[PDB]
Amino acid sequence: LTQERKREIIEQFKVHENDTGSPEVQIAILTEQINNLNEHLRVHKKDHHSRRGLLKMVGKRRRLLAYLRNKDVARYREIVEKLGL
Numbered sequence: 001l002t003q004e005r006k007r008e009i010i011e012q013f014k015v016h017e018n019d020t021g022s023p024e025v026q027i028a029i030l031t032e033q034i035n036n037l038n039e040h041l042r043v044h045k046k047d048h049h050s051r052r053g054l055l056k057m058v059g060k061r062r063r064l065l066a067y068l069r070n071k072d073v074a075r076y077r078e079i080v081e082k083l084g085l
Contacts, residue, residue, distance in 0.1 A: 023068045024079045030061040031083045 020026055037054050041047055065085075069076040 023064060023071075024075065027061060027064050027068070027079055028083060030057050030064070031085070033057055034061065 020029060034054065034057050037050060037057070041050060041054070044050075065076070065080070068079065
């Protein structure tokens with residue numbers, strides 16, 4: 001058993017997440033973080049550090065959304081509808 005094959009079998013057969021290779025899942029994970037961070041700033045108006053981070057996530061989501069819109073309008077509107085965007 002080579003290390004390569006041993007390490008490949010390891011990840012290949014470890015049951016769980018880390019998938020997120022889907023446009024919809026990436027858009028949803030971001031939305032969840034953007035929603036959580038906004039509910040956080042809601043009660044922490046004095047914050048300054050979390051502002052930059054939120055802007056980056058919003059931008060990265062616009063990009064992902066723009067990608068899906070061009071690739072497949074059906075999948076684009078289905079996800080926008082499900083996340084309430």
